[PDB]
A paper describes a structure:
Previous studies have confirmed that the B318L protein encoded by the ASFV represents a new member of the viral PT family, according to sequence alignment and a follow-up enzymatic assay. These experiments have shown that the B318L protein catalyzes the condensation of isopentenyl diphosphate (IPP) with allylic diphosphates to produce C20-geranylgeranyl diphosphate (GGPP) and longer chain prenyl diphosphates. Taken together, these experiments indicate that B318L is an essential gene for viral replication.
For crystallization, the N-terminal putative transmembrane region (residues 1–30) was truncated. Thus, the truncated form of B318L (residues 31–318) was expressed in E. coli. In this study, taking advantage of an accurate model predicted from AF2, the crystal structure of the B318L protein was successfully solved by MR at 3.2 Å. The overall structure of B318L adopts a canonical all-helix fold and contains 11 helices (A to K) which can be divided into three layers. The front helical layer is formed by helices A, B, and E. The front layer is orthogonal to the other layers. In the middle layer, there are helices C, D, F, I, and K. The conserved Asp-rich motifs FARM (residues 129–135) and SARM (residues 257–261) are located at helices D and I, respectively. The remaining helices G, H, and J, surrounding the catalytic core, form the back layer. However, there are three loop regions (S133 to K143, Q209 to P214, and H262 to N269) that could not be built due to the lack of interpretable electron density. The most significant difference is the various conformations of their N-terminal extensions, where the N-terminus of B318L starts with a long loop, whereas helices are observed in the N-terminus of other GGPPS. Since the experimental structure inherently belongs to the apo form of the B318L protein, its protein-ligand contact area is much closer to the apo templates.
Author numbering: 31 to 132, 144 to 206, 215 to 261, 270 to 318
Write the structure that this text describes.
Amino acid sequence: APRSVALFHGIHPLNPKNYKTFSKEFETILNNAIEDGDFKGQLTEPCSYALRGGKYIRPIILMEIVRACQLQHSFGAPIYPAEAALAVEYFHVASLIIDDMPDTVWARFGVAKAQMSALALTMQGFQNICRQIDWIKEHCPRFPDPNQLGALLCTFVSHSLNSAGEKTIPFFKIAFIMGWVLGTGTIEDIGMIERAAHCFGHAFQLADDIKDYAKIHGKQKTFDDVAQSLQECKKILHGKKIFTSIWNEIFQKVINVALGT
């Protein structure tokens, strides 16, 4: 596993942190991760262009799931999922690069470099997956069978990546499931977490479609779908004790999207 020089500093792993702090933390993680050697070659500029600035919400989901689960039980030195959250945003951003293709990513650099970049981000996302496993192996000796669980994570992210054409759901599935097994070597209720991620990604996509006196409803029907899926997701969350105070901020951000606020 090729190594870096530094990623994060002054981090309290299990502290209860709000979305903004989590966001600032992941931005420092992402920026530091560029520099220490991830995107070498002529595609150094493309990726950096694409990733810099964003909602970062999928990696944030990952990280909060892990920190919350680690509160419950620990395996010797709390797990702060950085390389894995990196990988989450990598996959999701590569999807975006591909979606914009025939300003944009392919505008400033060319469609050729655009797809070359997308492949680079997916590739080194898996590479940082393996890197997170290696970090776990060094600092977490009690962690249950890291090799098998890491292979299973790669397998699920695999199956999800090819099952994209909605297309917004699978990346949230990646975030949730990865954060679930990395917060705890469980695979005890992964399907429940699948329905949780699915409901949440559904509500997110619908809120995004709704984003702006035509009798066109206010598509109050679609809002009912959004809030119903959000309810069921919260039900699973508080059904596994990881429904923290972040999820309040997150749910209301989603809702305020659909409300025009």
